[PDB]
Ligand binder design. Structure first.
Ligand SMILES: [Zn+2]
Lengths: 283, 73, 87
């Protein structure tokens, strides 16, 4: 009779990627799907996979068109080794942040009536960037007191967003921490994704193109050095405040010289070292 | 019940507008399920472009409660 | 007690009255045009076509008829105070 705040929803890498891909595909709509998983203990709701369902709607609503597909998909996944059953649903809010609306709350009410601990996950594709993905998990609060019991600090570590608070967080629903537990093979595959072929490492680079690039950058550095000489004469006839706005709309010879130096050093050192390594390795 | 719903959704304050056009639109190609929109496709009738008195133009995939053939630019 | 109970009405000009049932087209100056209904205080006979009516900011329903707009240069022709001369 508690539902604790240390409860977490474990989203697999596959589930997260599927959710984000479907949401981004349906950028103007709130495309939606089901989440399969297990209810391990009272402190874990494991989400292992998600599958989209046939649905149609406008930019103001989206609804599913057939339940036969859902039943058949559950059966045909069980037949291949995924006996997990639905533990919630996911739908995308493209740019509105993460929260539930009235229709979302009604759907979550139906899911709660079916299974007590069902959860809803809102993933916002467009606001997601490379480093971070905007995603949250929710569950409803009855018409009562405090919705949950706190036996740790784990719940109060997220600082709920102003948009979610405006749209009803901690009043009509509460959030659940999302965790990304992975297995060894998932970790290894994610690390190996970006690994390149071995031959690419030792492959050299056309010397004509390399010399042309070096020549171009040195020619640019010449003019940058002229401008740097001009700029050094300043910085004494400049107000302490005026210096900051001095480099607004105007080139910075020092910064550009540093960048060009870095690129030239990297390219030339790499090429020379690769040349020597090949010279020894290949007879 | 449906008539009651229509009446309650027809709340009196309207915004006068002029019908700029009555375009004819047709579906383009197959739309993948999971993400298919009833407006961009699956709409074969007549669509209206209107200009509200607030100087705001709008496209109406569904004309509304007035039959299309009656409206003229 | 004047800012609490007395709301803010907006000047508009009625253009058409539709059907026997009250349905009025108004043209709020430089704001918009609406098809609006009356308030319980104002009787239908009070509102005619072409007269100025104040409308609330929420539902844009008529609340009070207003005097016709008149040029200042023609309204200043009225005598107001009459001369003291006699026959
Ligand atoms: Zn929603």
């Amino acid at each position: 009779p508690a539902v604790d705040t240390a409860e977490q929803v474990y989203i697999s890498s596959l589930a997260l990627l599927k959710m984000l891909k479907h949401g981004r595909a349906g950028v103007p709509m709130e495309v939606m799907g089901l989440m399969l998983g297990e209810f391990v203990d009272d402190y874990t709701v494991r989400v292992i996979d998600v599958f989209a369902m046939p649905q149609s709607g406008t930019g103001v609503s989206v609804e599913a068109v057939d339940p036969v597909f859902q039943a058949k998909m559950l059966d045909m996944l069980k037949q291949t080794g995924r006996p997990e059953m639905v533990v919630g649903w996911y739908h995308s809010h493209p740019g509105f942040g993460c929260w539930l609306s009235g229709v979302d709350i009604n759907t979550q009410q139906s899911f709660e009536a079916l299974s007590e601990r069902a959860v809803a996950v809102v993933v916002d594709p467009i606001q997601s960037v490379k480093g971070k993905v905007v995603i949250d998990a929710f569950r409803l609060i009855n018409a009562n007191h405090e919705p949950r019991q706190t036996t740790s600090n784990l719940g109060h570590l997220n600082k709920p967003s102003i948009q979610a608070l405006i749209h009803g967080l901690n009043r009509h629903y509460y959030s659940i921490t999302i965790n990304y537990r992975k297995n060894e093979l998932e970790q290894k595959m994610l690390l190996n994704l970006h690994k390149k072929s071995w031959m690419e490492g030792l492959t050299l680079q056309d010397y004509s193109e390399h010399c042309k690039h070096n020549e171009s950058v040195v020619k640019e550095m010449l003019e940058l050095a002229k401008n740097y000489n001009k700029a050094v004469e300043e910085e004494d006839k400049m107000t302490p405040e005026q210096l900051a706005i001095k480099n607004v709309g105007k080139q910075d010879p020092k910064r550009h010289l540093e960048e060009h130096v870095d690129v030239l050093m990297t390219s030339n050192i790499v090429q020379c070292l690769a040349a020597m390594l090949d010279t020894v390795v290949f007879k | 019940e449906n008539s009651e719903k229509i009446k309650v959704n027809k709340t009196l304050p309207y915004l006068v507008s002029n019908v700029i056009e009555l375009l004819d639109v047709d579906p383009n190609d197959q739309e993948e399920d999971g993400a298919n929109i009833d407006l961009d496709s699956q709409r074969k009738g007549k669509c209206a472009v209107i200009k509200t008195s607030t100087r705001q133009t709008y496209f109406l995939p569904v004309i509304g409660l007035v039959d299309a053939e009656k409206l003229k630019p | 007690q004047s800012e609490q109970p007395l709301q803010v009405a907006r000047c508009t000009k009625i253009i058409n009255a539709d059907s026997e049932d009250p349905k009025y087209i108004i043209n709020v100056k430089q704001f918009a045009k609406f098809v609006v209904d009356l308030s319980d205080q104002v009787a239908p006979t009070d509102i005619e076509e072409g007269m100025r009516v104040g409308v609330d900011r929420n539902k844009y329903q008529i609340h009070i008829p207003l005097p016709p707009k008149i040029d200042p240069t023609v309204t200043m022709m009225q005598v107001e105070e009459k001369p003291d001369v006699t026959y």
